[model samples]
Structure formats: C-alpha cells, structure tokens
Target: RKMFRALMPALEELTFDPSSAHPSLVVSSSGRRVECSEQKAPPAGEDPRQFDKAVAVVAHQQLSEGEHYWEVDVGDKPRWALGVIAAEAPRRGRLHAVPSQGLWLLGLREGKILEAHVEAKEPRALRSPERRPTRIGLYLSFGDGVLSFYDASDADALVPLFAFHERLPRPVYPFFDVCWHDKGKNAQPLLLV
Candidate 1:
C-alpha cells in the first residue's frame, strides 16, 4: 500500500523550544529549523530543561493521544538524530541516546550508517544500505504503542526504515539531534518539513 501525500495527516505546525535545546544548538526564531554552532550560547547556571551533553530539543506541541505524523528535511547532513522521546526522559547531563535512557532515536553515524535506538537493546543498523534519506517521515501512535520511521525523500512512496512497539504512558514530543559541528562536517540544519 502506497502512502500518498494527502494520506499523511501532518501537524499544522511543528516547532521546537529553544530552552529545551542544548546550548550548542541554535534554534531559529521560527522554531522550525535547528543547527549546530561552533560557539554555544551562554548558559544560565543550571538548566534542567536543557540538555548538557546531547544536542537535542523537544517541540512545544506534545502528543499524548491518537496518532500523529511529521517529516523532517535533513538536507545534506552527514550525521544527525531524530525520533520521539517521552516527557519523562531526562534532558540534562551525559545521557545515552538509547531506549534504556528514555530516548528512542534513529541515529545516523559516519554519514552512511542508519541505526535504530528504539528499545532496550543495542543500537543496530536499520537494514542494508538502500538509499540515504534526505527527508524522513515519522509516525507515532500512543494508544497502540508504536513508532515508525520512513525514508520520506519522496512523499508519494515512503520506505519503512524501522518500527518500534513500546508502552508509552507519558506524552511524547518530537526530538531533533543535530549532533555537533564536528569540524563543520555536519553543520546542516534540520528543517521541520
């Protein structure tokens, strides 16, 4: 079954919270684009809402019921992270980007390897390298306890990259991990497409 563009009931507006973003990440005023910066913004003492180690942020709009879908334009980014994390997830300190740590992310490392961090297991490649996704589609169903990631480079036909089944009692928010500048290798900003 082909999932057409209209079939995708996307959010009216998906935006991020700068305060929730890491100091190294720069959140645009519109809150739709996020980029990694070489020089991070000054922090005000201890901010539990901001991530100390992980370069990530949560959207102001939270999802706790029904199913929601959204897409992100990764552009030419070499490495980045995307997924949905529960409000219960820790946002500060050195945290592991894995399910055990309240994070269920799809990670891109080495610019080519795509891995899933969906559950209480080690991170593993999604599958054989077919095509790198410039854009990604995400689906989350709280009532059903499901989360799926798709290669949305083309919206007409999305390739299911990964899926997860977990009990989610807390509200989940859109997560973006722009990663680091890494000597300007992955400076591409993540756009909420």
Candidate 2:
C-alpha cells in the first residue's frame, strides 16, 4: 500500500510503437499486448528503427522529464525483459542490455530466475520475491535518476524487486523485450495496463 500510494500520482497510459518491434513479434491491434513468435519473418523492408537482433519494442511515448509510473501484466510468461532503453542506443545487431549500453532492465530467464542485467562490472544476483510477479509495476523519477521495478501481483501490496539509478542524459523510450516462444512455454503476451 505504501508503495502503491507513492506511484499512483504519476501513472501513465503507455502504448507500444509497432514500427520499432522486431519482425518476429505480434503486436496487438490496440498497441498494448505484444507476443513473440518463434518463427522469424522476413523484414518488409530495411527499417533501421526496428530491432535487428533483440526481440524488442518501445513505447511510442518518449520520456524525458519528471516522474512516471506504469504497469505491465506479464502473466505466466517464462522469459521476458522490461524497463526503458535510451533513444540513442543502436537498433541493429546483437543488443547488450546493460547500463552503459543505455538499457535499464530486469529480466526473467529459465522460467524462474529473475536477474538485473548489470554484466560483469556491476554483477549482482537477485533474491527471489516471495510471490510470483504475474503483474509488474515500473516507476521512474527523472530528477532523481532512478528507475524501479515492483511486483504488482497483489492488489494491495507492491513488492520491491529492484531499482537502477542512472542519469538519463538523453530521452528514452519505455522498452519491452518479448520472449521467444520456447515450444509454447513462453507464448504469453505482455499486457499494458
């Protein structure tokens, strides 16, 4: 309740930007739900704005000022990553989702391990949350240079998962890294709320 109250004021209504998604993703018609297909599709054209390696997409809205909060319903998805990516980050080739590379993210892998992507320089392991985070909350405070993630599984309780404090020298777009469908184990679509 304490956490929820603090974030309620700056909640944002975010939508996914389709043009920035990898061709392997299936974005919902409403621009909120996003799912990835194992079968990669041929690029319609050479679109540099879209991702060439990472199965990812960004919100249409670019965030550069003030505090903001938004929620994503990950449901039972096994593998996924969420947070924000710097607008200046490269869109082609392999994506290194690390702080210096302009990505502030938390990811779930192997269907159970949750980790903050800090690489070797700032390596750290995360303790498992008491409850499964079927729905997640993300909060960003530009002035404080803080971005935090929370477990929004319980309506009245928001559990702190992790936080990254890094200055945003340039504008950034809210990012969503869809999971590759691992034999249907990770086919759940990320839902925007």
Candidate 3:
C-alpha cells in the first residue's frame, strides 16, 4: 500500500475526508477537537535518530502499505503527532494475511517481542485499555485477526492480546485500525473493534 508512503504532502493545504483520510484527526461526534505531536523521519541516508521538528496538529487515520511517515495538520505551527493504522491492501499489505481476530502489540522502537496477549487461533475484535509506554499502537491481523499493540518508542515484536469477534453492521476495512475517544480530563483511549 504505497498509497501512504510519500514524504511531505504534495499539497499542504487540503481538507480532511474521514474516508480515505490520513491523520484521522477529526472532531469526534462528541466534539473533542483532537490534535497530535509528530516528528518527520529523516530522508534516505540521514541519521535515523535525527528527526525534523515536532509539531502539534490533528492526526488522521489512513491505511497504506509502505514505510512510515509523519501525518500532521498543515496549518499554523504544525501540531505534531504520530499517525498509525492497520494498512492492508489487496496486493501489497503490511498485515494482509492476518485475520480480523488475531491481535498483538509490537514494540517497534526497541525491536523486541513484548508478549502474546491473545491465545485463540482465530480472533475478531481486539480491545485494549493500556498502551501507556508507546506513542503509537499497531494492530496486526492474522488468524481471524490478532490484535497486537506496537510500542512505537522502539521497534519491538508485536505484543499479542486476546480478542472476541464483534459482528459489524457494515463491512469494516480489510486491515488493522486504531481509534480513540477522548473522555475529557484524561488522555483519549484507544477503541479497538
């Protein structure tokens, strides 16, 4: 899914489309204006530790198969935040073969395999309450979709978790997903379906 691998946005000043949208930063139905803090990765042959300035902006949710890039709102001082989602495509997918139930959390920064949370061979819905240590949470789909949370702080193996299947009224996307609902006075929580 090269759909989301470009460096800087070709067009900076553009509106957000909830569907096929990046930086899934949207005004939730509850009217929480969510924003993010993000840093741009260095270009090829550049220092891996070196990153562009981080900013505070609204992050959107988009699924694309390819290397990672920063998704920040292109307005004002650039609200910074890391943008992550399950990117699965027909031909090229980051977690294409996984099912909707298999879920795991991986520590991408440390590059270590955290723990296997889910035990079922087949899974459906993955719900997690804590992703405290990492800035980004990744859900890897495998058998019926295994939910694995990724600690973006360091590149570690996905930590697996247990999940149950929830029948969706409508067909969901074919890959991993990350969602949050701000309950006020507390950091938003991830909603894994």
For model 1, how does the per-residue alpha-carbon lDDT over 22-84 read when each residue is reduced to its tens digit?
888888859888887776556633877777778778888888888888889987788888988
Q: Give the runs in model 2 whose Cα sits over 4 Å from its true position.
A: 1-7, 38-40, 119-123
Among all windows of 10 consecutive residues in model 1, the one with the lowest summed lDDT is 3-12
* Per-residue lDDT of 64 in model 2: 93
Position 79, candidate 2: lDDT: 91
* Backbone clash numbers for all candidates listed: 0, 0, 70
For residues 38-145, could you state the per-residue lDDT of candidate 3 as single tens digits? 333222223221111211122233322322222121121111122222232121113322334322222111112222323345323333335434433333233333
Model 1 lDDT, residue 154, Cα:
70
Candidate scoring better on TM-score of 1 and 3: 1
Query: What is candidate 3's TM-score against the reference?
Result: 0.25
Candidate that beats the other on lDDT, 1 or 3, i.e. the better one? 1
Q: TM-score for each prediction?
A: 0.90, 0.91, 0.25
Task: Give residue 159's error in model 3 in angstroms.
Answer: 2.6
